[PDB]
Design a protein around this ligand. Sequence first.
Ligand code: CA
Ligand code: CL
Ligand code: ZN
Ligand code: ZN
Lengths: 307, 310
Amino acid sequence: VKVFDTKEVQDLLKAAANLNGDAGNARFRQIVHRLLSDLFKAIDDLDITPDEVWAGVNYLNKLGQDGEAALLAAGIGLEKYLDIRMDAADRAAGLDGGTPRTIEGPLYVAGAPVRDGVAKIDLDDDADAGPLVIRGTVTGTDGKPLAGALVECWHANSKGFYSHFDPTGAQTAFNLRGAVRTDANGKYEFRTLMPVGYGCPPQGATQQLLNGLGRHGNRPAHVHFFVSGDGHRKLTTQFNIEGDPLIWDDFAYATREELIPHVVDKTGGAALGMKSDAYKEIEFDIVLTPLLDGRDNQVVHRPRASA
Amino acid sequence: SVKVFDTKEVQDLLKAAANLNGDAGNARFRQIVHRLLSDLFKAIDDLDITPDEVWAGVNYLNKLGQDGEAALLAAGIGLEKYLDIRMDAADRAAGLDGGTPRTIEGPLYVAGAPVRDGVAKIDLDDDADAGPLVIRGTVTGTDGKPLAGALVECWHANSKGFYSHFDPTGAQTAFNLRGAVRTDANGKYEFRTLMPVGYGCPPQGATQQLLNGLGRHGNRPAHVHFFVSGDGHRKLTTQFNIEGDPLIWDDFAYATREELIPHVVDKTGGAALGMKSDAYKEIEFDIVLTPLLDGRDNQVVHRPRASADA
Ligand SMILES: [Ca+2]
Ligand SMILES: [Cl-]
Ligand SMILES: [Zn+2]
Ligand SMILES: [Zn+2]
């Protein structure tokens, strides 16, 4: 049977979204009506059974109980899709030359202390992670260095865990999370340890759905960035650690070819405060896009953790 | 607004996300996920849903599951009724629409109630504000013959609108206002209980938050839930509404049916029946069950349900 087009179903959808209601939140009602209508049509078209529907409802309970809705948003490509739509708007406006955006992911933590020029961000010992310097210059698309720009980063430890989200025990607040104001020449530097890739909580809702699809829930090793500066839009980006076997098989679809810098082996680490003389260096220069008529049309407000 | 949905990049992303080109797996699940994700992506593109709006929706899903309310929302936005609409249409096409009308289960069934022969008294806790109610009827097949030994289960709320096992103000006795009766040799069942009152969604919960955003209330008229089952017959999920409730045709869960509003009769003689006052109310609620088609019940629903020990 197919019932979606009947007046009873169409009236039910109008009532459920309160389309004929008194003045209210029209945009919200419009969105709810569209999503509900699409869901009802999919159920009808695919003959989705009550048992199947209630299994989906149960999944939503687990997803929220696990606090994983934003992790799922990354894992089924919704987060990348938002970037696709933002990139398409920038392309239509004729923008080029900026460092490409990529997904934020769900693990930013607000409030890290801001240092001038350089920050050492590994607060907790991690014997399995070697020392890493990340440094670069921030410019605008005209090539000029941006002084006093805010460069923020966050990344995982050798076990794939982030501070404020570590299920094995609390890390020091802001471990492997940093904020630096660029110097007069646009330079920033973080002294940290090398990340290893993230994986979804194995018993959580995201991995349960991925298992049902036959997909893994792993990311290659990477470092997240927010970069902002006077006169410029806020950039959300990342880089991947060169050579990681998952670099082009990220469960969150976030890799971009311009965001895979070279890793260089260096010496002299002790004089930089590193835990060994031998360390790795990544030079990651960043180009910000100017504001348009003084506005940033792509900055995203979403729930974010704090200290 | 940009329109990117129909691009190869987006269609490839959807195929990858649902693993359509992966190894042999759960094809049905991949098909459903791909359709729902595709529809979601298309809606975002068509309505220019912004990242801020999407992340507010994601945040809502976190709250919904934290509150344990996904099945309450399913009722409140009409999805639970929609499943009944589809089951009713299938029954009409199949000629299996001759029994008592179905309505929604709702999310508050609890397995494990003690079963009594013929008559059960189910008000285990006193409730000064609720008067005594007898519910009784006969269970027959569509051919009119009584069904002996059929299982009639019912559950309903107290005078504050709360159900046992789901009461936030304090623990009711296990199985308060929940019971099961095996019909007698002539198909008869009877419950002795107290009159339910309707109720609203948890006011701070995710379902009411969404309903508030839509400008809708989250209330149900007073009602009583039933499962009725028996050998050789399909399992009925139904309810009745208490006659005269002002919300009877303004139920947030869309569950009212005109065939399921029985007359309420005033009676006397309650004390002899173990009720707390001479005056009481009686509701007759007869049940007509449909025989199995081809030996299997193709409308019975499996979903997560609470359970408890008496
Ligand atoms: Ca530790
Ligand atoms: Cl932590
Ligand atoms: Zn990450
Ligand atoms: Zn109910």
